[PDB]
């Protein structure tokens, strides 16, 4: 009967759909989706408006450029959910299996907790005005292009962070427990005047390209003058040299 | 061209003047890519990246039994998916491919081959050269139409000229493409104000001829009216230059006569003039168009007699910038139209 369920409600979302959908397309992708229940569960470019009850042997999702409407429970997931440009409602709580999450181009305003040793995550183009905790795990992030303006600590794994064009107002307690081979850690378009005494501390195995930030003459001129010296040995930061 | 614009957009957006630098030529889109080294400060004018046959296979070519999992190795570019956006909301789908720190120590542990190509040693005789990590394809075709826009090269505008057009230039950008490529480099184990001169120029070119200079005018149109044929008399020009002969079958065949005195013999300031042409022309990036429509006008002229009240405003920045360092390209634009209707006027009026 739980099939017969998933059919009929199919079948009412389908045709009482108002009437602007390839949801008959979607349909016959959701009988083989169901029906066998493919791997991917692809429904990108297909513009479901809602996206009902999923299958519980679901493994990777893929969404994009769907909906508008806020997603039901993902209850049980394997690797890859790939959320772009649906909505703006919350994320379901994610499994242990979760381990990428790229909801780019979305508009939820409230990352929820994000638990677990999630990897790969890409939040970017979003309204976020605070983020929780990050895992340890996590080792690519972009966070780019978003209201964030009280970044939270980084992990220690990360190695590309691209956060710019945010509201962040001060350069975070950074978490230069990293020592990937290039951090590429673009903070570029940002609030900042205020720089911590530690960036004498950062290896030069780094890249903070801190333009666009407002800084105060007495630190930048003190930035020229680590970097007019010939012995610029700390991160390869470029300034904005009115850039 | 918008390739030029809308890259050198991405590379603002997404990181701002640093060593990831825009594609400028629109038709030569994909011809450079990831594993393409193309690229030499060989004498050019500081941002220059050659079309030439040379790529990274080209120069540094594997040729061992282990090529076929270098397949894998080498195709191996990243396809991570970034989201530009500005207010050109909308999100064009740019993909970065850059080749991995590994394998930048691998190429560096390696060494070079024996049997490379002539463009090399055509190409790398003083080359600083810049190489292509980080390069940024498109995913899906992204035809995008786009306007115009500078800084305060208006002076042009200023003079009696009101520049109210419209760039309404749509390009079609297909799937697995190019916008901008981040440049480093690994050179090589050995393995007078123009004003005056300009006058030493203006006399050694009005030296020249006529129906020779209508070829120089209109091979300057097919040159200097579309990107192609600027790199094809550009190639052909700096073979002139080094070579010192002539093949018969070059279309630019009475320049090569003007050139080449009225006697034949190749005045190397002659040589070197057309050469610093086609400098500040290149140096006037898209003006392609403008100046095959100029050609057809017979107004340059009116253009340099413009940018002549402007030049002479304009001495300031190329004798502030050092040659060697970073000019105001600017002020290189504006010096650049003094020599091209300087020059192409004491031309064009016969000798």
């Known amino acids: 009967t739980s099939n017969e369920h998933y059919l009929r409600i199919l079948t009412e979302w389908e045709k009482n759909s108002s009437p602007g959908e390839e949801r008959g397309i979607a349909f016959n992708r959701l009988s083989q989706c169901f029906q066998n229940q493919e791997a991917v569960l692809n429904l990108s470019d297909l513009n479901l408006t809602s996206l009902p009850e999923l299958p519980k042997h679901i493994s990777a999702l893929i969404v994009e450029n769907n909906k508008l409407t806020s997603l039901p429970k993902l209850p049980a997931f394997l690797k890859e959910l790939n959320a772009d440009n649906n909505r703006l409602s919350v994320i379901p709580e994610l499994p242990e299996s979760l381990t ?86 673009y903070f570029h378009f940002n609030q900042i005047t205020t720089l911590p005494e530690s960036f004498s501390q950062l290896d030069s195995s780094y890249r903070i390209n801190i333009s666009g930030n407002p800084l105060s003459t007495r630190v930048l001129q003190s930035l020229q003058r680590l970097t007019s010296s010939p012995d610029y040995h700390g991160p390869q930061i470029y300034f904005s040299m009115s850039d | 061209s918008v390739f030029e614009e809308i890259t050198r957009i991405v590379v603002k957006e997404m990181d701002a003047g640093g060593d990831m630098i825009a594609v400028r030529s629109l038709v030569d889109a994909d011809r450079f890519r990831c594993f393409h080294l193309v690229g030499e400060k060989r004498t050019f004018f500081g941002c220059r990246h050659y079309t030439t046959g040379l790529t990274l296979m080209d120069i540094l070519d594997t040729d061992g039994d282990k090529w076929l999992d270098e397949l894998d190795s080498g195709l191996q570019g990243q396809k991570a998916e970034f989201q530009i956006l500005d207010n050109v909301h909308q999100k064009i789908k740019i993909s970065e491919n850059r080749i991995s720190q590994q394998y930048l120590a691998t190429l560096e542990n390696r060494k070079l081959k024996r049997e490379l190509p002539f463009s090399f040693r055509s190409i790398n005789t003083r080359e600083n050269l810049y190489l292509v990590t980080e390069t940024l394809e498109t995913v899906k075709e992204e ?34 493409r190019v916008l901008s490529y981040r440049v480093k480099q690994l050179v090589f184990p050995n393995k007078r104000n123009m004003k005056e001169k300009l006058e030493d120029m203006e006399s050694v ?36 230059l080094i070579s010192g002969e002539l093949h018969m079958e070059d279309p630019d065949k009475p320049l090569l006569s003007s050139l080449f005195n009225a006697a034949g013999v190749l005045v190397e300031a002659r040589a070197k003039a057309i050469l610093d042409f086609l400098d500040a022309l290149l140096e006037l990036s898209e003006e392609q168009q ?61 000798p």
């Not at chain 2, 786009?146 to 009696?160: A, E, L, P, T, V």
């Not at chain 2, 107004?299 to 190329?318: A, F, G, H, I, Y």
């Open chain 2, 143 to 176: 035809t995008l139409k786009s306007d115009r826009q500078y800084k305060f090269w208006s002076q042009i505008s200023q003079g009696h000229l009101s520049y109210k057009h419209k760039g309404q230039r749509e390009v079609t950008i297909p799937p697995n």
């Open chain 2, 290 to 350: 403008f100046v095959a429509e100029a050609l057809e006008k017979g107004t340059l002229p009116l253009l340099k007699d413009q940018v002549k009240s402007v030049m002479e405003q304009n001495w300031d920045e190329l004798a502030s910038s050092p040659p060697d360092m970073d000019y105001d390209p600017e002020a290189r634009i504006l010096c650049a139209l003094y020599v091209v209707v300087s020059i192409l006027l004491e031309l064009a009026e016969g």
């Open chain 1, 100 to 185: 990428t999450l790229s909801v780019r181009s979305n508009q939820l305003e409230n990352l929820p907790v994000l638990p677990n040793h999630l990897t790969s995550l890409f939040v970017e183009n979003n309204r976020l005005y605070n983020l929780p905790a990050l895992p340890e795990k996590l080792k690519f992030l972009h966070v780019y292009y978003n209201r964030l303006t009280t970044l939270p600590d980084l992990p220690d794994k990360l190695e590309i962070l691209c956060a710019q064009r945010n509201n962040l107002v001060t350069f975070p307690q950074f978490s230069d427990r990293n020592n990937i081979r290039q951090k590429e850690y």
């Open chain 2, 205 to 240: 070119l009005k030296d020249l001829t006529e129906e020779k200079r209508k070829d120089v005018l209109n091979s300057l149109a097919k040159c200097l009216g579309k990107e192609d044929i600027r790199q094809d008399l550009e190639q052909r020009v700096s073979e002139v």
